[PDB]
Amino acid sequence: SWSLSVQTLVFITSLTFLPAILLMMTSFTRIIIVFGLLRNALGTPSAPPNQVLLGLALFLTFFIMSPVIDKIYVDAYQPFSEQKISMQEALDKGAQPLRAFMLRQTREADLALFARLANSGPLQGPEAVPMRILLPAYVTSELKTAFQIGFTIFIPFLIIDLVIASVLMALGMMMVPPATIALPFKLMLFVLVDGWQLLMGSLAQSF
């Protein structure tokens, strides 16, 4: 254990990187990109405010991190009080669940690329991946996953738009823009199937 003043300095300094921790280490990027792509899908880039989407992504991130938060509480929050482990052995012990989660959500190709970017030859085991190699690989994997989910969301709305345009063309209309007609049908399909709750359920299942 080192000095209390140094501990305060380090704690307040690490408090600054909270957006970095939320974005790079948790899943927040995935939900935020999925929400952005879904908003782009419905054809209305300002229908729900950016604030509301950010808060919804924050709540989803909190739930989906609740198991990792519980593991942190068991391994770090509690034993720091009983003083069986503290300072070093614990902060790292508490960060271990984050490492397990990010290993689970990271693809092998990104990790391989970032290892050969750091000349880390003897990285043989999969539970001793350094943070420098694990973090950007995890972010890239999250970007790929979010884009895939966005395309899957895109498919039904694209189908609806194409169907509306095809019926307009077949009915004889050649000048009517299909977007105006298809927008309320997109909304009634989204509400009627209750798209939002199934979307969040799938995102939670998507881990």
């Binding site: 729900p48 989803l60 509400v191 798209g195 969040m200």
Partner: peptide, 26 residues
């Protein structure tokens, strides 16, 4: 837990109630 979902699931209301208001005009 699911309690947080509730707030997140409230994200549906924004759409669901919005459809009705429009409906009376769209």
């Amino acid at each position: 837990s699911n309690a947080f979902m509730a707030l997140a699931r409230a994200g549906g209301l924004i759409f669901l109630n919005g459809l009705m208001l429009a409906l009376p005009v769209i």
